[PDB]
Each structure stands twice: as C-alpha cells, then as structure tokens.
Structure 1
Amino acid sequence: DCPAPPPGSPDIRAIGYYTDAARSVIDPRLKTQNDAAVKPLNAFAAHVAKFADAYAKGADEAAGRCALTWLDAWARSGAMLGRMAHVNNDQSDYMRQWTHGAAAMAYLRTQALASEQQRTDIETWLKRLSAANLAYWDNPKHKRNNHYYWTGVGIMATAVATRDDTLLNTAQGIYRAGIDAIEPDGRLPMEMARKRLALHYHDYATAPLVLMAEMARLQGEDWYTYRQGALERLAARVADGYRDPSWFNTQSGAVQETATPKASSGWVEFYRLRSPDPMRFDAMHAAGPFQDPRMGGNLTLMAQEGIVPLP
C-alpha cells in the first residue's frame, strides 16, 4: 500500500517542447524527452495526491502517513534545492514550481498526522522551496504569466500549513497580480498570446488563482472580494469558450484547439459555489469529476468535503 519513497534529487533537467514563438505547437519528440526527464517529479506528485485523496476517504490514516513519509524523505534529501539545469528554456524552474505546489498541497491536506520531526523537516523544506521559487520571479525578464500564478499554489499552501503571515502576504500578492492582469473584456493578454491554446491557457491561469482563493477560506478570508467581479469575467470567458470559441478565435488570431475541460479545469468545482451566476458553469461541471495532483488531487471531492480532511 505504501511504496518506498522514491529518490528526491536536488537537481532537475527538464526540456521545453514548444516549437513556435507563441508556445502553442508541440514538438512530440521533445515532449516525450521531457516526460522521461521529469518522470520522478510527476510520479512524486501523483502519488502524494493519491495518498491524500485516500486519506480523505476516511478510515485510512495509513494513507495520510504515507504521504508524509514521502514528503519527509524528499525534505531530508533536499529535493529540488540544487541545480535547475537549463537546456532550451526554464522548464526545470517550471517543474520546481508545479512540484512544490503538489508537495505543499499534500502536506496541507495530511499535516494533522505529522510527527514533530516530520513537521520540522517538511515545513523547512517547503519554506526553502517557497524562497527559491519566489527568487526566480525577481528577474523581470521572466514574464509573469500562468507560471507565476502556479508558483502561488506552493507558496500559499506552505503559508497556510505553516501559519506564516509573511508567506500569506506573498501569496496574496501573486493572486492579486493575476486578478489585476484581467482586462475589462475578461482576457489575460499573456494567455491570449498563445494562439490555438488561448482558451486552454485562460483555463490554466484561472486554476491556481481559484485554488489560492480557496485556500484563503481556510483562514476565513474571502479573496473574491478583491476587484470583485474581475475573476468572474475571466471564468465566464472560459466557460463560454468551451461552448463557442468565437471570441477566443478572434482575439487570439487562431482557431482554438478542440478540447474537453479536464484535470486543472476542476477549479470550476470550487468556483461554481462562489459565483453569482453558478449555473453557467454546469456544462464544465458535467465534464468532471476532476483530478489534478498539482492542485492537491480530487477537486470534485475537495469542493464538497473541503481541501483539508478533518481528523
């Protein structure tokens, strides 16, 4: 039931796989190469989320403890705190952002079961990852698109799990940077620049923003009041776009790739409970249930049961 914690190397060597300026067309050879290079990272995320979801079913404290054993093993090896090797882009940094998010979400969900040593080990590691991922964004040449918002997932989950007001403020700034970037017509310009993937990337940018706001409810706060309505305009564009892509087609200059909502689209499971117009999200909700390790696991269940199971 609990496989051995897998190796948590300090180092990452991921491979970018888009061929065009708009990062909208995939080179399948490079995608296959990247998949193999980052398999340990994706496997770690998938398993800690699987264990957290199993813990959330109840009567399975062993599953929660399994997630903590895996997290503690990576914390003790200094996983991801070494070299972010750069081959053709910053894919290694993006992988550290997403994997920190998965790890921090799993810790947030399972930490009630942590030993004293596991809390110290894991929290120290998650704070070191927060600082390292934040520092990446100090260079203004790193464009603060959806990768920046995704960085906020791990920072926010670490902030809540450690009750760190400084990290909570940092995460709030990242969330608000995304909200502030929404234009009156609902677009996020850096995601609209992704041609046939413009809808996909508006969905993918919405995901971490919603998840951050949902984690803020764990501290009693309602982040949807910040620039209230702006996130709704973006979310409504996404839902509309799955029905009729004509606005994304015109504004992006490309016919959108045909796709069903999946995985991280499960932000809708939370957001439909917050929106003033919930029923407009029914068609996206019907594509569920939604699971994404980078968001903590089963979004459909967490929206009903809460992100953190209670003991």
Structure 2
Amino acid sequence: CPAPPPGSPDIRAIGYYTDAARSVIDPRLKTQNDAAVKPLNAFAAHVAKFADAYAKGADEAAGRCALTWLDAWARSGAMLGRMAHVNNDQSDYMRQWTHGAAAMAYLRTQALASEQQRTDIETWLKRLSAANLAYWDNPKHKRNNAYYWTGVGIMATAVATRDDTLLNTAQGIYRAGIDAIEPDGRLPMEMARKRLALHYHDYATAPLVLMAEMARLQGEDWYTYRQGALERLAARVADGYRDPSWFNTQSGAVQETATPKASSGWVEFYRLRSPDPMRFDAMHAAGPFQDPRMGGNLTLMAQEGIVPLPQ
C-alpha cells in the first residue's frame, strides 16, 4: 500500500468555459485546471482502484489500503478549508466530486475498517456533506447537474453511517432532479448547453441513477418516484448517442461527436431496471465503464453489487 499523498484543506481550481452557456472550452485554462486539481483526481482514482481490487475477492489488503488513504485525508481535514472562486466555482465542484469518490470508496470497503478509522472517516464525510450542502443555500447557484452530483457523496455518506437525516437530505436532491424532468424528457438547464446538451443529459442522469441504486441498500425504491420520468430522460440519452437529431433541434446546436464513457456507466445499473432495456444495448457495448467519482468500475458493480460481500 503506497503512501497516501498530502490531503490539503484548501482547493484552488480553475474554470475553463468562456461562453454564457458554458459550452466553449478554453484549452489553456483546461490544461491548467488539470494541474491544479491533479491531487484530488489522483486520490479519487487510487481509492476507487483499491475498492475495485478488493471487490474481486482474495484481496483484503486492497480494501485496507483504501481505508488507509481515506483515514489520512480525514485526519488532515482534506478539502474542509478554503474554496477559491476564480473564473467560476470549479473548486466547489471539485469538493463535491471528490467527496463522492471518497464516500463511495468508504461505503464499498468499510467492512474492513478499524474502530478509529470509522470515527475519523465518518466524521470527515459528514462534515464534507454539510459543507457541500451549504454551498447550495445560495439560490444564485443554479441547481443543474452539479446539484444532483452533490447528492452522490451525501447519499454514500448516509448509507455508510446509517444516518437517516442525511439519507432524507440525499432523497430531496434525487427528487429535485426527477421533478425537473419535463414531460418530453428534457432537462432545460442541461438542454441550454448547446453542442454539449446530450453530454449533460447523460451527465445529469448518472448521479440520479447511482443514488437510486444506493437507496435500495436502505430498503427504499426511489425508482418508483414519479415513475416514468427517469425512463423518459434515460431513453433520450440512449437515443441521442444513436442519433443526435432530437438534441440538435432541441438545443439549437449540432451535438459534439462523443461516445459514451466514464459516468455514462450508469447504464450498467439502469438497463437492469428499465421497462425497455434493449434501448441501452449500444451504450452498454461501448463499455466497460469506470468512474472513480461513482465508486470505480460500474460495469462490475452493476453485476456484483455496489458493496462486496464481506469475507
């Protein structure tokens, strides 16, 4: 188990969108944001890799390594300090995404935690939850897909610590996303993203599906909430990768040519749930899907279960 890197209290990230619709990328800004957020993304990638390795079985050491990394960042109060707002709110988004990855890793490996690791890690995860939730008390922050993504870390924290009030907090975020889906399946704030409209409908679906899967671990069936709406949005995403003409006319821009990847792996879970699974065949075939911000290997988790059976 390699030594965990420093886990700084602060985050000073860099926005890289230049147009009001946030669909035009500034490459120098993006390359430079990649350097600023490197330790956060490397921490997320490593813990998810350890949790994946633990989930294969016969590799308890990998699970304990993830817990060693999570404890080190809990003990240094990683990401609980100052968030710089320069160009936009990329720092707050990094705290959200990285909290989710850390919380999913803990949820997947916590069966191996010592008592001290549980105290440290769970306290750190609940303070991250509170800080990420408080960011959205400002109504000037539009609750697009970044709000839904904030639910990931809150939800995984709630399940891992059996924290029912935090569970209900995540439920309100999931229900807000479902309630924003229009009868034709549009999410207006994602459809405002021009050539990235399809990309961001995909991106909005991913944390909603992952939260719904996690709710099953607490005996709740969030898929029935306004049953119909999630399927309508997910089917539009699948249709869009097959042929983008609906997103072209709805967004007013020819969609970027991108294939499904990373967080598109929500389809691995959702195809086992949909009233029309075959629509997701091409999306499935573009896998396997890995996203550290979603707990790691989504292809394997959809078939194994998010949490490995304890040894």
Same fold (TM over 0.5): yes
Matching of residue 69 in structure 1 with residue 46 in structure 2: no
Kindly provide the CA deviation profile for residues 225-244 of structure 1, in whole angstroms up to 9, marking residues without a partner as x. Answer: 00001000000000000011
CA deviations over 1:249-298 (Å, ceiling 9, x no partner) = 01100000001100000000000000011111111000010000000000
| Distance across 2 between alignment mates of 1:4 and 1:94 | 26
Name the structure 2 match of 1:135.
134
Distance in 1 separating the partners of 2:207 and 2:89:
20
Aligned to 2:96: 97
Whole-angstrom CA distance in 2 between matches of 1:103 and 1:39: 15
What is the distance in 1 between the residues matched to 2:111 and 2:236?
38
CA deviation string 1:179-209 (max 9, x = no partner): 0000001010000000000000000000000
The structural deviation recorded for 1:75 is 0.3
Question: Does the residue aligned with 1:34 lie in a helix, a strand or coil?
Answer: helix
User: For the residues of structure 2 that align with 1:73 and 1:129, how far apart are their CA atoms?
Assistant: 15
How much has 1:86 moved relative to structure 2?
1.4
Aligned partners of 1:285, 1:221: CA distance in 2, in Å? 26
Residue of structure 2 in register with 1:60 after alignment: 59
1:305 positional shift: 0.2
- The runs of 5 or more residues in structure 2 that have no matched partner are none
1:176, CA displacement in angstroms? 0.3
SS at match of 1:279: helix
Query: 2: CA distance between counterparts of 1:6 and 1:188?
Result: 39
CA distance in 2: counterparts of 1:182 and 1:276, whole angstroms: 18
Q: Distance in 2 between matches of 1:134 and 1:149?
A: 11
Report the equivalent of 1:7. Answer: 6
> What count of residue pairs does the alignment treat as equivalent?
310
TM-aligned CA deviation for residue 25 of structure 1? 1.1
Please state how far the C-alpha of 1:3 moved relative to its aligned partner: 1.1
Q: CA deviation at 1:87?
A: 1.2
**C-alpha distance in 2, partners of 1:88/1:189?**
24
Q: Give the deviation of 1:19 after TM superposition.
A: 1.2
Q: What's the TM-score once normalised by structure 1's chain length?
A: 0.99
Distance in 1 between residues matched to 2:216 and 2:69, nearest whole Å: 27
Question: How far apart, CA to CA, are the structure 1 residues paired with 2:234 and 2:206?
Answer: 10
Identity over aligned pairs, percent: 100
Q: Deviations over 1:27-66 (max 9, x none)?
A: 0000011000000000000000000000000000000000
Cα distance between partner residues in 1 of 2:37 and 2:268:
28
Write the distance in 1 (CA, Å) between the matches of 2:101 and 2:219.
23
For 1:63 and 1:21, the matched residues in 2 are separated by 44
**Deviation string for 1:107-142 (max 9, x for gaps)?**
000000000000000000000000000000000000
Q: Distance in 2 between matches of 1:12 and 1:3?
A: 23
List per-residue Cα deviations over 1:125-170 (Å, max 9, x = no partner).
0000000000000000000000000000000000000000000000
Mapped partners of 2:7, 2:275: distance in 1? 44
Cα displacement (A) at 1:24 = 0.6
Instruction: Determine the C-alpha separation between the residues in 1 that align with 2:258 and 2:14.
Output: 24
Write out the 4+ residue segments of structure 1 that deviate beyond 3 Å after TM superposition: none
Q: Tell me which residue corresponds to 1:22.
A: 21
Query: Aligned with 2:81: secondary structure?
Result: coil
Deviation, structure 1 residue 219: 1.3
Q: Indicate the larger mover: 132-141 or 213-222.
A: 213-222
- Aligned-residue offset at 1:222: 1.0
How far 1:301 moved relative to its partner? 0.3
Distance (whole Å) between structure 2 residues aligned to residue 70 and residue 161 of structure 1: 17
- Determine the structure 2 residue equivalent to 1:199: 198
Give the superposition deviation at 1:211: 0.2
Inter-partner Cα distance in structure 1 for 2:19 and 2:191: 15
